[PDB]
Design a protein around this ligand. Structure first.
Ligand SMILES: C/C=C/CC/C=C\CC/C=C/CCCCCCC(=O)OC[C@H](COP(=O)(O)OCCN)OC(=O)CCCCCCC/C=C/C/C=C/CCC
Ligand SMILES: Cc1cc(C)cc(C(=O)N(NC(=O)c2ccc3c(c2C)OCCO3)C(C)(C)C)c1
Lengths: 239, 228
């Protein structure tokens, strides 16, 4: 009943419910994905959908989130699924590679399924791949971002009152603010010596967005995304 | 509750003053199809001051030559939204950029970019709600110039600079709020803009690209800066 870096944390353990995997991603008919890879794309799609449900359910539980006018529950999730997967990927992807210099050739999609940079390439998307791991995966490595911090940022990326068309802007500003207060406090009461930590963290957020918008450029390109049905799917999933 | 150093205090000073000067609404306007040319010419002048503002800034020269020009291509389109947005009059719900035929729900509509002005204004109400200072805004602009772009020679540099600014705006909003906790929230909502300025900035590039292959007169200056 209170939004805290504490609840948000124990709330990470809670595993999804592989009930209905809604098609947020799939290979459209007559898409321009070359047949011999039309099997692989689709399998990755199947992976990203499972994940989106893990996010729609995680969001639903977050303290107060469900006391939001339902119209809004949908716009905040629709408004962030994609940035939220890249964040979880770059987080996950931090262990696989500690690699003049060798670019980190690995990227983790979900446990025990790690994309390799060479097929990132063969797909032409090699550039968003390096951006993920260097701008996010790697820069989090150095920063030594702890798990508390990482669930805080999510909480923050979800509770965006800047989403167009929300029925109650204030009802989501307060939550977001409750997370800045938490994030700032934790940050001092922890790495006290670390000044500018609170801002060094909040700064991954605009990159996470550029990289996020980037991904869609590609996703729509190959007709992989189906943004039309999304809201409905989310709508359905909440309930 | 450390007050600003003397160098911090002095910095905030150099910037408030050295901003009014490049007061976006420029007078050099001497223009001696659809009026797409107004929207367009304006933008040009505007971007032009921005590039200049982007210089007298206690950082630049330090950055390389070609490296910096990367900082402007990115920084410029976003930072322009900030200047237009700083003008949004609450009373009428519109940008009053010396209310030239510059950017209005009208011209924009006549020049077939109907959907766009709508979005600009959303982010306008949004920014108008935080009630930023003049220091807020200044510092903010700078923190956007030195925001880390893709392809920077030594991003480690642009990052210690930008952090200098970043600390001043924190210490500033800190005293301004006498060590209460609200400060972090205030500070937060500001960095919070930096992330939304990126969508608009990019929503932009994708706009040139659309006008570009729909046959339109986009000035070799814009096409340059925000290449297409
Ligand atoms: C948010 C993402 C979360 C989970 C992912 C959801 C599914 C999207 C799939 C993207 C994974 C890309 C890497 C793996 C690809 C394997 C297929 C392959 O090698 O295709 C080559 C083919 C050569 O074609 P060819 O050009 O047509 O034909 C000539 C032969 N070259 O390429 C293709 O068929 C292109 C397939 C379309 C890929 C869409 C990219 C979407 C960007 C995802 C964002 C995340 C960043 C990291 C992902 C790398
Ligand atoms: C006030 C302004 C600011 C800047 C930085 C460039 C131009 C300007 O010159 N134009 N307007 C836009 O780019 C433009 C404007 C606003 C907008 C957009 C676009 C795409 O989409 C996202 C939300 O809002 C063009 C179309 C004439 C290039 C106008």
């Amino acid at each position: 009943q209170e939004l805290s870096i504490e609840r948000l944390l124990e709330m990470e353990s809670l595993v999804a419910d592989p009930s209905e995997e809604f098609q947020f991603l799939r290979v459209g008919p007559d898409s321009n994905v070359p047949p011999k890879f039309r099997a692989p794309v689709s399998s990755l799609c199947q992976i990203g959908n499972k994940q989106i449900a893990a996010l729609v359910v995680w969001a639903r539980d977050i303290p107060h989130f469900s006391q939001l006018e339902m119209e809004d529950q949908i716009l905040l999730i629709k408004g962030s699924w994609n940035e939220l997967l890249l964040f979880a990927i770059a987080w996950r992807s931090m262990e696989f590679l500690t690699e003049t210099t060798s670019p980190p050739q690995l990227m983790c999609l979900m446990p025990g399924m790690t994309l390799h940079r060479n097929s990132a390439l063969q797909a032409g998307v090699g550039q968003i791949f390096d951006r993920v791991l260097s701008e996010l995966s790697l820069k989090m490595r150095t920063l030594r971002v702890d798990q508390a911090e990482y669930v805080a940022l999510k909480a923050i990326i979800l509770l965006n009152p800047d989403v167009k068309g929300l029925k109650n802007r204030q009802e989501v500003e307060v939550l977001r603010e409750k997370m800045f207060l938490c994030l700032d406090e934790y940050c001092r009461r922890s790495r006290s010596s670390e000044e500018g930590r609170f801002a060094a963290l909040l700064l991954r957020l605009p990159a996470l967005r550029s990289i996020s918008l980037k991904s869609f450029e590609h996703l729509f390109f190959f007709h992989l995304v189906a943004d039309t049905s999304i809201a409905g799917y989310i709508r359905d999933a909440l309930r | 509750v450390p007050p600003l150093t003397a160098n911090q205090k002095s910095l905030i000073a150099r910037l408030v003053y050295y901003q009014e000067g490049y007061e976006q609404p420029s007078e050099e306007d001497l223009k001696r199809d659809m009026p797409f040319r107004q929207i367009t010419e304006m933008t040009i002048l505007t971007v032009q001051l921005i590039v200049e503002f982007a210089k007298g800034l206690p950082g630049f020269s330090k950055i390389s030559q070609s490296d910096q020009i990367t900082l402007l291509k990115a920084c410029s389109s976003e930072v322009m939204m900030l200047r237009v947005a700083r003008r949004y009059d609450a009373a009428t719900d519109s940008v009053l950029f010396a209310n030239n035929q510059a950017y209005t729900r009208d011209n924009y509509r006549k020049a077939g970019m109907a959907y766009v002005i709508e979005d600009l204004l959303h982010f306008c109400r949004c920014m108008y709600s935080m009630m930023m200072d003049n220091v807020h805004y200044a510092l903010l602009t700078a923190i956007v110039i030195f925001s880390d772009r893709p392809g920077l020679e030594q991003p480690s540099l642009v990052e210690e600079i930008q952090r200098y600014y970043l600390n001043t705006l924190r210490v500033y909003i800190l005293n301004q709020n006498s060590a209460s906790p609200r400060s972090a929230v205030i500070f937060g909502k500001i960095l919070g803009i930096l992330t939304e300025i990126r969508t608009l900035g990019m929503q932009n590039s994708n706009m040139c690209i659309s006008l570009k292959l729909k046959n339109r007169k986009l000035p070799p200056f814009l096409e340059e800066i925000w290449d297409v």
